């Protein structure tokens, strides 16, 4: 019910909405949704690196 | 008080106003004021004229 491997935990919304409040004021709500990718770090250490 | 030769009977407004009511609706009020001229007709008759 509250959780499981076979249910989605969110919705994809990337549409931009314009809300005209009156007196010329506009509420602009920008939705952005992106499929993000991740991969293992080349090292698990914190490295102090010089160039 | 209510009338006379030395008082103006109206105001000159030729500005255009935009009233944003909300939900994207706009009340556009266009004011137009023009100095108008008139002159006597060449004839005081109604004429039935052929070309």
Automatic annotation (TrEMBL), chains A, B:
This is Major capsid protein. Belongs to the parvoviridae capsid protein family. It comes from Hamster parvovirus H1. It comes from the Viruses. It is found in: Virion.
């Amino acid at each position: 019910g509250g959780g499981g491997i076979g249910v989605s935990t969110g919705t994809y919304d990337n549409q931009t909405t314009y809300k005209f409040l009156g007196d010329g004021w506009v509420e602009i709500t920008a939705h952005a949704s992106r499929l993000l990718h991740l991969g293992m770090p080349p090292s698990e250490n914190y490295c102090r690196v010089t160039v």
